[PDB]
Each structure stands twice: as structure tokens, then as C-alpha cells.
Amino acid sequence: MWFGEFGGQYVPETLVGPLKELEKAYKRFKDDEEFNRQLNYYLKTWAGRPTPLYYAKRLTEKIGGAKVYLKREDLVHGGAHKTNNAIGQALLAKLMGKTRLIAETGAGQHGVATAMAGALLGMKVDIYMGAEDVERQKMNVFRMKLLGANVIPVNSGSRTLKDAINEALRDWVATFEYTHYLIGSVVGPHPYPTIVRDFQSVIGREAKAQILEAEGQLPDVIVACVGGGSNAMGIFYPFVNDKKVKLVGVEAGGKGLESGKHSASLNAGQVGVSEGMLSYFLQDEEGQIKPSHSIAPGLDYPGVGPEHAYLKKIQRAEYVAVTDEEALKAFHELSRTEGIIPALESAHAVAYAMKLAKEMSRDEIIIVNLSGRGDKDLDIVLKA
Amino acid sequence: MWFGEFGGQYVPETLVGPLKELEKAYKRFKDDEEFNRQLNYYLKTWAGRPTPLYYAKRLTEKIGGAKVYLKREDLVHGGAHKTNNAIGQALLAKLMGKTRLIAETGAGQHGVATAMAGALLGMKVDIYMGAEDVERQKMNVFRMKLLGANVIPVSRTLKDAINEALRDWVATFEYTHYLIGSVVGPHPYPTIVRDFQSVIGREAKAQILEAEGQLPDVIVACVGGGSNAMGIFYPFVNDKKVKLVGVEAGGKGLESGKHSASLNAGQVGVSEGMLSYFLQDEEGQIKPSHSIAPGLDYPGVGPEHAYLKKIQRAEYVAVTDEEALKAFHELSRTEGIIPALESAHAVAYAMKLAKEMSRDEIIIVNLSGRGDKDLDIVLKA
Ligand code: NA
Ligand code: NA
């Protein structure tokens, strides 16, 4: 339940039971030969795992320092790492005997991932989306409708991801008998942060095998973008006990850390309770959760996963920020140099890895998690 | 050069030299250790090959008939099989000492695939695109711009761009490679493109043997020019028991005069440097084609598919625009795969054939692309 001083189950007594059952179900199926066979089969034949580890020779040679490798989560079915978790929790829910999936979404990528997995396994999908996010993401809303999922708009509060998350929890209390709440990051009450991380750990496990095969050694640095922290925990977790491997999470620096217009929870936030967890949250002087900003909608969350809060306190992972402008330059650079259009979320990771590569030895190795493809982001890259 | 009676290099003397020098280079590299090592490395680490072979169990049991496997070219980098051919020709170009790639596109897809492959290999990419095609497909124009390609605006259709690109190549062939996005045109393009897409059928073979212990009874692929169909078909061509079915665009209807089916209702002729079936009027001028799927909207068809209809090795059917849209929606709701409207044609015909077959039998449908590109078109309907 706890990652050092961070995490927990900060929920009403109505949710304690549901989460008890979820936890008992996960303990059972986590190691069940049939669950893991099914999960592995769907990840291989349906998602297209294992994703490749691509050596960006031209980017590497242009910067003239560290070998830059890209973990290509952009190539997974749906175009984002979110599919790995979406499949895992939908299979669990199915085996738990649930018939309906509910999910929060802000970017819409978790909504699409939940809708695909719900369509794959023949479950009803209800996507609680902030009313502001629905109008922001008209195309992703259409994809979800084509996949057979209903977008239920959340009109409460900031009408964003925070509000969508709590509306969904209020439904789950009523519906938990026949419904699994499918959380799309390493956030929320226990056991969600552990489950989401366990289902994203496949990224790191592949990437470790692939970098040992390609270079015959572990990476010097692993760089991943952090919204809630699922793709980052995914690639980090298997290297956590490899002490020489440096872990760097890149949060949304937005319009600048000094601007107040960002999502860098771990850089600028204060320890607090929201969405049923004890973690770093952007807070005003009064102590209320402040609004977040990122050009990358997937990094636009005021909070961060508790396990990242733990990794920051023990100083196992360093957390940095990249601005909207640095991310945009990286979006263009990776496109022109490697013919790969990265998600704006992922372009944060690429932006920091490029600055870090320049300062580093030619023999040294950076793995960047390329969390998604940028097809969904072309309109906003156009506007800028 | 020849696929029985069909094929050839039916081009002006100015293009004969370039095509002969390309032909000599392909011979050199097609079996070279280093070329194939470099190509396989890019297809593996950049493109994400091999793509999976997916059993659509919910679709299969819903039909009640044969097992429906989907070959998932939707999951290759760029979201279409076209990447396999783009990498192949682009790397060949680089090893030939070419510094520039040029291509033509209307739909935009082949433009993007060339831009991606060009960027990967650090070669200049000039895409010729008709001003009328540009305005319709503004997002693919940005995509190419992002990928560092120079989109050169040109009835402002595909034709006027092809002629502009053939005038470019005649001059620039010394440092430039013309990248062709289907098994069409003069020799050696129809052979080269099929060879670079054949990887689909070799993967699909090993994968279906691992899965079901036996080769498929039928293989179903959509057919515009016929690269994705040739890619999955070709390795299985010698396996006599394996039936091959290409699906063309039945459009508004095969009798409606708004289709793109060349192998059904087309007459043998010489256009675009090749001897193959084309959609022709009474006068025998090439008629315009219509398909809701932009990739299937080609007046003609590749010569090797003409050869396969002639020796009756491959049956060639059309599916209506309406049937393909029902297939697009069905596969999305049933298997949570949003297919390309191109691919949906193959899926639409696969759903008919399955019901009229035994539950023990196997259909492999080539899912040629993902339907992210075709969302604005499906919204219209
Ligand atoms: Na954050
Ligand atoms: Na045709």
C-alpha cells in the first residue's frame, strides 16, 4: 500500500471493500499460469509486443555524445504504452467476472486504450471525460465511439482529469459487482499504483534484454516522460536494483517552472492527499490543488504517482522538467532526423535525452522511452 | 520483366537508361549479405517487423464458420505495409550512391512512407503532389513537412504529378531514385516492390504453422495496385492447396460506373509503362476510378495479378463501399482494431467466405493498414 511515506488508500469506507476484492483478485491472478498466458498471448498477437529498441544513429551522430536508443512504445496497438495496462486490467476484470469497464481520460489515449481492450474482450466501456477535455479531443472521442464506448462528460469542478477520476470512483461504489474501474496511470488508491506499474514493467523487461543483446551492457541512463508516471515506472522498475543505471523522469515544465503554468509535481509540488493517494501535488499558498498545464495533454496532471515520490526521496531517480517549447523542438528534430513522429508527451523525454547526450561519452548509452506516436498531436503542433 | 503476357518497360528511350541502371543495381544488392543485413535491421528495429498474426476469436465465433487470422500490417511503423517497400527502395537508393528520393501520391500515404524512409536514411525527399490532392489531404502534407520532405505543388491530379516526377527522374536519375508505392509501372518496379513486400507472406507462413500446424485454406488481401496482396500471396504461390483472393473496390457498384475494379471490368492496354488491365471507356481511353478507400482508387492493377487471374491461381472479387464501411465498424466493435478502409474490403469479403466454409478451415486476411487516416471519411457516412 505504501512506497516509503507515499501512497495509501485515502478513500471513503464505500470503496474499501471494492479495493480489498481487487487486491485479493490481483494477488491470485498476478502469478496464475492461465492469466499470464492470456495476457502474454494478447500482448504478442493483438498489441504487437515485443516493441523494438531502435538505435537513433543520425540523432546520436548529430549530437556527437551518447548512443541514443528509443524504446518504441509508439509501435504498440493504439500507438501508446497505455495498451499494456488497459489489456492487463480488462483481462483481470473479465476473470474477476466483471462485465463493464469505466475509465477516466483527459488526453483521450487511456479512453481509446480502455475502449479497444473492452472491445477485444466484449465488455461495455463507459469513459468519464472532463467536459473541457471532450471539446479538446473530438477525434479521440470519435475513435472511442467507433470502438463502442460511451463518453460520459464530467461537468463538476475544473471539468478535467481530477474531476473525471472522482466521478468515476462515485460510480464504481454502486457498480463494483459487475464493473472494474480501469485507472490509466500509476495513481489512485492502493492497489492501482502497484497494478499499473506491474502491467507496464514489460517495457523495462524487454528494454533490458534488448540493450544487453545490442550493446552487451546495461544503459548508463534511462529517460522517460512522467504525467502520472506509468510509462516511466514501466521502463524504470526492472533497472531499479541496477545501481549504476541512472533513472531520469521528465515532467511537463509547461510555460516555465517559474510561470506557475506546468505539471512538474515532483519539482514544484508539495506532499498531499488527492485521488486517494499521498503524493506530490501542485498546491497554492492556501494548500488547495492548483491547475496544471502542458502542451502535451497526457502530462497535464497536477499530481504524480506515489512510487515516483518514493524514488525521488531515496534519490534512486532524478526528476527534471522540459518546457512546451523544448518538447516542440524535439518533436520536429526526431521527425526530420529518424522519420519517427513522437507523441508530445514522449518528446519531453527526447528533449532531455538530447541535452544529456551532448555532455556524455560516445561509449555511453541513453534509453529514451518513446511512450506514443504523435499522429494525435499534429493539429496542436500545426497551431504552434 | 514479364509475368506471362503482362509487364514490360513501355516507356520513352530517356527512361530506358535509368531503369536499366536500377535493374543492374537490384541484381547486385537483392541477395548481397550487407544490403539484406541493413534492410532486416531497419525492418526489425525501426519498422517493428515481424508483425503479429492475430486470431479474431470473437469475429470467428460471431460468423460461425472458418477461423479468421488477421496479419497485422496495421502495427508496422507508419501504420501500413507501404513502409516495407519504402525502406527497401530507399536503402537500395543509398547503396546505389543516390542522395535524393522523389515519389508521387494523391491520398498522401505513399508520400509519408517515402518521407519517413528518406528521413531515416538522411536522403533529400521531393514528393510531387497535385494542388487539388494537396488541399484534400492537408494533414499528410504537414506530416511530410515534419519528416523534412519538400512537397512540390503541381487537372492538379496524380497524373500531372507522375508526369512532373518522370520529367524530374529522366534528368536527376544520376543522384535521384524514383520510389513507386505499388507493384505497378515499368520493370523492374513490379518485381522489386513484390520482393520488398514478400516479407509479409514469409512471416505469415511460419506464424500460421506455429499457430494451427497447417497452411491456410484461403488468403484474402485488398488490391489497389496489389503490393500488400503480392507480399502475402507470393510465398504461398507454389503451395497449390492455398487459395489466393485479391479484393478490389466495387465502389457505388460494379455496374454503377463508380468502381476501381480493373481485373473484373478492365480491358488489357499499355499505360504507366506496363502491360496490364485498366478501366477503359468505349473509345478505350482510361476511365476515372472511384473508391471510398483512397488506396484502392487506382484505374489499373499490377501485372503479376493479371498473370494470376489468367492462370486462375488467384480469384479476384470486388466489395461495395457500403460493405467495407460495415466491415470497418464491425472489426472496431468486435476485435478493437480500427482497420484502413482499404483493409476493410478484405475483411468484408473474409466475413462472407468464412460463413460458407467449415469451422476447421483457416482464412488469413491481410490487415494492410490502420484506420486512423480514414476517420474523417467514415464521419461523413
Ligand atoms: Na504531473
Ligand atoms: Na484497381
Author numbering:
A (entry chain A): 1 to 384
B (entry chain D): 1 to 154, 158 to 384
Task: Quote the authors verbatim.
The second enzyme we screen is a previously-engineered β-subunit of tryptophan synthase from the thermophilic archaeon Pyrococcus furiosus (PfTrpB2B9, or 2B9), which catalyzes the bimolecular condensation of Ser and indole. It has been demonstrated that 2B9 possesses a broad substrate scope, and is capable of producing diverse Trp analogs. This hypothesis was further motivated by the location of H275, which is a ‘second-sphere’ residue situated near the entrance to the enzyme’s active site. We also observed mutations that resulted in a general increase in activity across all substrates screened, with H275E displaying the largest boost.
To determine how products fit within the active site, we solved the structure of H275E with two ligands bound, Trp and 4-Cl-Trp, at 2.39 and 2.25-Å resolution, respectively. The structure of H275E with 4-Cl-Trp bound showed no major conformational change is required to accommodate the 4-Cl group. Instead, there is a 3.0-Å halogen bond to G298. We subsequently validated that H275E has increased activity in single substrate reactions, and these improvements extend to substrates that were not present in the original screen, such as the sterically bulky nucleophile 5-OEt-indole.
